[PDB]
Amino acid sequence: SNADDLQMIEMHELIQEFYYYALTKTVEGEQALTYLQERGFTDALIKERGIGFAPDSSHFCHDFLQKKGYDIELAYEAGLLSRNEENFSYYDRFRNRIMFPLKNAQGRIVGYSGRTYTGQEPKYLNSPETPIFQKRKLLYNLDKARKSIRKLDEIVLLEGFMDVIKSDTAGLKNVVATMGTQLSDEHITFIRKLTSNITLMFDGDFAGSEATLKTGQHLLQQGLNVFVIQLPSGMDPDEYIGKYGNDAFTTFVKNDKKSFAHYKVSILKDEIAHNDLSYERYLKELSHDISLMKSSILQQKAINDVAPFFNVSPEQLANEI
Ligand SMILES: Nc1nc2c(ncn2[C@@H]2O[C@H](COP(=O)(O)OP(=O)(O)OP(=O)(O)O)[C@@H](O)[C@H]2O)c(=O)[nH]1
Ligand SMILES: [Mn+2]
Ligand SMILES: [Mn+2]
Ligand SMILES: [Mn+2]
């Protein structure tokens, strides 16, 4: 019910204050605080994002919510507690982790992502699916980014919410990320209402490129204008910012922004040049990709940029389309 959903949100918003105190003030939180500071988190950014620490006792959240008068079973359904199935007893889901609030599209805290700071697995532990937290719907930072997305008529999608935090602080505000999932049909429906222009800047590795191709292809087929920023090999946005600084980052993101078709063919360049079967198949694929582009201006530019990869004229490529 809506009443239950609101109670679950309250639980999240109240415990956030306790996690924040635990991180910034308590002895147990000192190592986690140092870890964040070494990753460039200022006191101000930690406060701004409401970042906290979940102690390792296994009953910190449980006892707090109990004292405040919340139903324990509801706290379990809200994803803040786990249940011992042999015992039927409850305990903290999040233990010894740095706690990043996950806000919904209206800016209410509806879940947490808890990162290890001691090399434990999983690296990140999220809230489970709950009535208020759904990974196929939530986009990290969307409530904060919405204004600039509309103003700039573009959304930028990163892999990691940490990348979003760093990018935002660096000056790139129109950024969001999923919570470790493939961009959903629901996400795309949400995004389309804000803008038709989406730029993908995933990590600079094989998995990142593969995800760029898959996600970009689907966005294109869904009728969006797709762009790609290619980070240096082995780097994600947080890592680029750390190495080159804010100004270099916001300049970089403004420089080599390629239409999806141009990015795709550049990835496939060597296979096309050596494998005649792939040559034929990718010429047809790229022809189809270009045909899907809603922008007449960018469609014509893509034709000019893609044609040389096949050693054909822009006129010949246009004919194929
Ligand atoms: N559920 C879950 N999601 C994860 C896990 N590890 C990574 N992810 C998700 O995948 C995204 C990208 O993975 P990474 O490239 O390792 O993210 P990252 O921002 O570089 O992580 P760090 O900089 O090391 O803090 C993360 O932001 C998470 O949303 C995990 O262990 N469990
Ligand atoms: Mn990766
Ligand atoms: Mn990364
Ligand atoms: Mn990273």
Swiss-Prot record:
Cofactor: how and how many bound: Binds 1 zinc ion per monomer.
GO cellular component: cytoplasm; DNA-directed RNA polymerase complex; primosome complex
Binding site residues for Mg(2+) 1: 159, 203
Cofactor list: Zn(2+); Mg(2+)
A Gene Ontology molecular function term of the record: DNA binding
Catalytic reactions on record: ssDNA + n NTP = ssDNA/pppN(pN)n-1 hybrid + (n-1) diphosphate
Toprim domain boundaries: 153-234
E.C. numbers: 2.7.7.101
Function: RNA polymerase that catalyzes the synthesis of short RNA molecules used as primers for DNA polymerase during DNA replication.
Domains (record comment): Contains an N-terminal zinc-binding domain, a central core domain that contains the primase activity, and a C-terminal DnaB-binding domain.
Complex and partners: Monomer. Interacts with DnaB.
Family: Belongs to the DnaG primase family.
The protein, known as: DNA primase
Species assigned in the record: Staphylococcus aureus
Gene: dnaG
Complete-protein stretch covered: 111 to 428 of 605
